[PDB]
């Protein structure tokens, strides 16, 4: 009963952590394509392929990943609202703080026309958020 709440929060927090890693790995890959397409060491064929690849990253994909992240945390918060003990109510409080931050990041992404700039606006925040979510996992398990 109460165990299924703890299990549900653990699953959704783990999925949120994975989603952040997916977003950060996308940023890393995007960055390398932008570097490659202006590189002086690469030939024209290779730079052209890198320019094509840099153009295939979408704001839609970033926004989808952020909606996936928000949804995992929102389920975590709804489930954690059933927590009653001193340590797991603290986990619930951290998750609500993280939910609010995710909404702020989704708003920041909207106000950036340039996709790389949108990633740059959120990378520090999501890296810190992943660490905070790792703390949450320890607080309850």
Author numbering: 208 to 348
Per the authors:
B. burgdorferi BBK32 is a surface-exposed lipoprotein with multiple roles in vertebrate host interactions. While the interaction of BBK32 with fibronectin and glycosaminoglycans is formed by non-overlapping binding sites in the intrinsically disordered N-terminal region of BBK32 (BBK32-N), the globular C-terminal region of BBK32 (BBK32-C) is now known to bind specifically to the initiating protease of the classical complement pathway, C1r. Previously we have shown that the C-terminal globular domain of B. burgdorferi BBK32 (termed BBK32-C) blocks classical pathway activation by binding with high-affinity to the initiating serine protease C1r, and preventing both its autocatalytic and C1s cleavage activities within the C1 complex. In fact, there are relatively few examples of pathogenic strategies which specifically target the classical pathway and BBK32 is the only known inhibitor which directly blocks the initiator protease C1r.
Importantly, the BBK32(206–348) construct retained full C1-binding, C1r-binding and complement inhibitory activities. BBK32(206–348) consists of five α-helices and adopts a helical bundle fold. Starting from the N-terminus, helix α1 (residues Ser-211 to Met-245) interacts with helices α3 (Lys- 256 to Ala-286), α4 (Ile-293 to Lys-317), and α5 (Leu-323 to Ile-347) to form an anti-parallel four-helix bundle. Q319 and E324 are also surface exposed and together present a contiguous surface region.
